[PDB]
């Protein structure tokens, strides 16, 4: 879907932990192109749970690396 | 879990991979806890400024690397989490946490040297 | 520049009231708010029911002020499990650090008007644990208190003599007269 | 900001800065101190080991204080404002004394002028004669002796009363101050009805009753506060009505006020006052109290100088006015589908018992 | 003419409320209280015994049916943990 993608993009641009905004694609990765070491990763996942009100699983959590990884998590979820 | 709410049965770590999992394990439950922390304890400050300070709680461990030591860590970690999560913590407790709320401030050491030395050793 | 106008002879004018421990009383408005002041007073001291916070041994103590020899209950002292149906509280025991957040909380909910009584060396001054890491320095660290009775433990005379000494307090606290004065 | 304070008349104070058991070495005489905000000041003296001292009238209504010292250092003296022997044998060790002696109400034992002006007077007197080294005297946001309302003009005269027997005489001038057991907050949040006779506009810039005892503690240690005046005001502007809402808005609860007019409020203000033996919010002087619109001095030292800056009031609603609001399971919104359905997963009635 | 009033009562509970089937268990009681009533008065008369008999076994049934509806919730209750109609 593209609905979420324009809400992702509401957390990751108010994120004061990005390299630099407008850096974010479709399948950006969160570490090699947005420059986020391993707790900050942590945090984006957790803000992405709140926008979706889902719950995420920690397993599920280390799966998702990548914006495409979230994009695709969140629609296989039927909450949103 | 069985013995009570948010009881970790104590474990150790199998290897490096084994001990990374569960400290990213316990950091996204502190901070995913956060909101229920401030309603709960009804601290004065953003759930913002309260997960700043789990970040910095794990920050001052980043750097060990000795498998037995994260060990006790983790376990601390989850002793605190329960009894945070649990309202057996009282709100004199979880904001002690806060060095801010302290009526001498949080820069509780002298600036340099000579802030220090026309005080009187801070 | 005398501030204002009648400033320097408003000097020599100026009445100087007696203090209330040393005030008397004189008319019948003034007698008749002292009745009150002993009515209410009486009422005061002869309903002494404290909320007896029995932390240690010193409530074994406290414990036998309701026994037979001593018989609290014969002058009107009826020990109440809430603070909401009390009028005093008897710290009676050694606080720990852990427990002073429930004692601030159950001294919190105690109506108005209300007394605590230090009871025992531990709730005075810390005691035989003065120098733990676990335990208040004395009580009046976290509640205001009215009496301190002494002893480790103080025996069952010697609580009852605190709380005599208490409801003295009582009997001479001025009510309708402190209002009458301002 | 030292070990070592030289006071006004040159004592040196080598000082242990420290908690409860340190020496502040201060010697201070606080007048007025068992009301609201007599108790941030004394707080803040006793915590770092300073000897403060207490006149009081009702011996039940002081016991508080004690709490916040160490042994010896809460000291409790029997006054009345009309005992001098009183007033200066609480005052002559003394090397500070604040007088936060007021009332908003007249009294049958004491009059505007008796508590405000004749109040001051004998105590500054009290001050020049043992030669106190600093003597700040709080006053009210407002003050001027030329006003009609008697409270600003009784403030007004004792402020130049105590400048002229005590030139170095601090002056502090609080705005309405907010916070725990305030006037403003909690008499908004509580009263189901207000007699208020002029629609909640009056205007002023409240600030917090902390700030305020925070700076008078601030005085203290800077000898350059001296001969000074301080007003002493929030960030923002507000009015009893936009403040009202702030309120409601926390409480969950709708304001309503009878305003009735003045020429028909006043003089029943009056007869409530003269009858009623507490404080009830309501008097004549009060009703025209709430005509007037706080007018800050442009030339008095602000929070600035003291190197402080007020919060606004719409900060500290909810946290003050928290347990105000009703959280019965009657109360919560309506539940989500996603409530709904969770629902389903429990069994709602113990049929076994 | 109270107890026709009162029988508006129990049938304007039905009119104004969509949502709250407990008013709907406390409209049917006052319904059958106000044509109790109107028994009553009327058999006072008509000097007739007979007026407060069957008022007195209305009574008896309609406690009767409001313990069979309150336990009939109670089972509904149990398995929904609600008693709102969502609208
Ligand atoms: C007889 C009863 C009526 C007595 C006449 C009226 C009372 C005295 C006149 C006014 C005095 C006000 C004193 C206020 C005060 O001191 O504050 C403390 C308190 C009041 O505290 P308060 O000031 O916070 O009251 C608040 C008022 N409200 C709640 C509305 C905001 O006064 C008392 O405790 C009452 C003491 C006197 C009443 C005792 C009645 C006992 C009657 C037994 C029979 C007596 C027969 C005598 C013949
Ligand atoms: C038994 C009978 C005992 C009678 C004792 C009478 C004592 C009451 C004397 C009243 C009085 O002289 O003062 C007037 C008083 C007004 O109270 P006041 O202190 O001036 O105001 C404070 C805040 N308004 O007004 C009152 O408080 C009177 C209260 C009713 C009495
Ligand atoms: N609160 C506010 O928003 C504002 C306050 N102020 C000024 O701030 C100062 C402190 O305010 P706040 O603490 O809120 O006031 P409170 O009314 O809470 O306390 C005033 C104090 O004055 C004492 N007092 C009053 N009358 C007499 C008297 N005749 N003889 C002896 N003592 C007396 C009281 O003692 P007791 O308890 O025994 O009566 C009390 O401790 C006062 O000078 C006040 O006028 C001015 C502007 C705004
Ligand atoms: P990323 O690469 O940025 O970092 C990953 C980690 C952290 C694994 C490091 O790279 C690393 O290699 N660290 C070494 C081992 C390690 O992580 N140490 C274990 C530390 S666990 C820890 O610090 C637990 C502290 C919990 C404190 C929580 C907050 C305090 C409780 C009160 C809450 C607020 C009041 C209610
Ligand atoms: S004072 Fe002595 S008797 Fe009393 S509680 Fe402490 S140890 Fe026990």
Redesign the pocket.
């Known amino acids: 879907k593209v609905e979420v993608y324009e809400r992702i993009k509401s957390l990751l641009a108010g994120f004061d932990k990005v390299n630099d905004p407008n850096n974010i694609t479709e399948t950006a990765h969160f570490a090699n192109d947005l420059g986020l070491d391993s707790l900050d990763t942590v945090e984006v996942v957790m803000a992405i749970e709140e926008e979706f009100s889902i719950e995420i699983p920690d397993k599920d959590a280390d799966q998702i690396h990548s914006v495409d990884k979230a994009i695709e998590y969140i629609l296989r979820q039927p909450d949103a | 879990v069985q013995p009570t709410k948010f009881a970790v049965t104590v474990r150790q770590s199998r290897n490096w991979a084994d001990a990374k999992q569960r400290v990213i394990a316990a950091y996204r439950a502190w901070i995913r806890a956060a909101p229920e922390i401030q309603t709960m304890y009804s601290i004065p400050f953003p759930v913002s400024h309260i997960r700043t300070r789990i970040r910095q709680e794990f920050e001052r461990h980043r750097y060990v690397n000795k498998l037995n030591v994260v060990d006790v860590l983790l376990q601390q970690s989850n002793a605190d989490f329960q009894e945070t999560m649990n309202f057996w913590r009282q709100q004199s407790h979880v904001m002690a946490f806060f060095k801010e709320e302290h009526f001498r401030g949080e820069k509780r050491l002298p600036s340099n040297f000579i802030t220090g030395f026309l005080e009187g050793r801070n | 520049v005398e501030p204002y106008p009648g400033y320097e002879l408003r000097k020599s004018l100026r009445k100087e009231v007696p203090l209330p421990s040393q005030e008397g009383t004189k008319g019948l408005?003034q007698y008749?708010?002292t009745?009150?002041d002993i009515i209410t007073n009486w009422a005061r001291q002869g309903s002494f029911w404290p909320m007896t916070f029995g932390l240690a041994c010193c409530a074994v103590e406290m414990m036998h002020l309701s026994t037979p020899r001593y018989d609290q209950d014969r002058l009107g002292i009826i020990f109440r499990a809430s603070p909401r149906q009390s009028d005093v509280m008897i710290v009676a025991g050694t606080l720990t650090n852990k427990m002073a957040p429930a004692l601030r909380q159950v001294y919190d909910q105690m109506p108005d008007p209300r007394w605590v009584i230090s009871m025992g060396s531990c709730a005075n001054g810390g005691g035989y644990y003065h120098y733990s890491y676990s335990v208040v320095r004395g009580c009046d660290r976290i509640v205001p208190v009215d009496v301190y009775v002494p002893g480790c433990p103080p025996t069952s005379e010697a609580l009852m003599y605190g709380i005599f000494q208490l409801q003295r307090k009582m009997r001479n606290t001025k009510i309708?007269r402190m209002?009458?004065r301002? | 900001i030292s070990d070592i304070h030289i006071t006004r008349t040159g004592k040196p104070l080598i000082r242990i800065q420290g908690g409860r058991s340190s020496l502040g070495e201060h010697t201070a005489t606080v007048f007025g101190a068992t009301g609201q905000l007599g108790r941030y000041i004394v707080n803040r003296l006793a915590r770092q080991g300073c000897t403060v001292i207490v006149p009081y009238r009702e011996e039940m209504a002081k016991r508080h204080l004690k709490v916040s010292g160490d042994l010896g250092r809460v000291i409790f003296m029997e006054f009345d404002l009309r005992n001098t022997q009183s007033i200066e044998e609480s005052v002559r060790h003394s090397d500070v004394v604040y007088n936060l002696i007021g009332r908003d109400?007249?009294?049958?034992?004491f009059s505007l002028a008796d508590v405000h002006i004749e109040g001051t007077e004998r105590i500054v007197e009290a001050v020049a004669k043992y030669d106190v080294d600093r003597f700040i005297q709080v006053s009210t946001y407002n003050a001027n002796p030329d006003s009609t309302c008697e409270f600003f003009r009784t403030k007004g005269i004792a402020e130049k009363v105590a400048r002229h027997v005590f030139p170095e005489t601090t002056i502090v001038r609080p705005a309405p101050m907010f916070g725990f057991e305030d006037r403003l907050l909690l008499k908004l949040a509580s009263v189901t009805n207000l007699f208020t006779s002029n629609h909640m506009r009056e205007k002023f810039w409240p600030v917090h009753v902390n700030e305020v005892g925070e700076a008078l503690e601030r005085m203290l240690y800077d000898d350059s506060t001296a001969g000074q005046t301080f007003e002493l005001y929030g960030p923002r502007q507000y009015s009893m009505a936009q403040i009202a809402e702030l309120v409601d808005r926390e409480i969950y609860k709708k304001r309503r006020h009878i305003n009735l007019p003045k020429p028909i409020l006043q003089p029943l203000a009056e007869l409530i006052?003269?009858?009623?033996?507490?404080?009830?919010g309501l008097?004549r002087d009060q009703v025209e109290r709430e005509f007037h619109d706080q007018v800050i001095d442009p030339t008095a030292k602000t929070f600035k100088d003291l190197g402080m800056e007020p919060t606004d009031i719409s900060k500290w609603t909810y946290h003050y006015l928290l347990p105000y609001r009703p959280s019965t399971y009657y109360d919560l919104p309506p539940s989500t589908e996603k409530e709904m359905r969770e629902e389903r997963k429990y069994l709602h009635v113990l049929d076994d018992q | 003419n109270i107890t026709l009033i009162l029988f508006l009562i129990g049938i304007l509970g039905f009119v104004l409320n969509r949502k709250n089937i407990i008013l709907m268990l406390i409209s049917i009681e006052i319904m059958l209280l106000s044509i109790t009533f109107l028994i009553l008065l009327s058999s006072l008369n008509m000097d007739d015994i007979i007026g407060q008999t069957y008022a007195i076994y209305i009574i008896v049934v309609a406690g009767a049916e409001s313990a069979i509806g309150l336990g009939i919730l109670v089972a509904f209750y149990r398995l929904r943990g609600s008693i709102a109609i969502e609208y």
């Not at chain 4, 006052?273 to 009830?280: A, E, F, S």
């Open positions: 408005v008749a708010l009745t009150l309708t209002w009458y301002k | 109400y007249p009294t049958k034992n006052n003269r009858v009623l033996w507490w404080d009830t008097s």
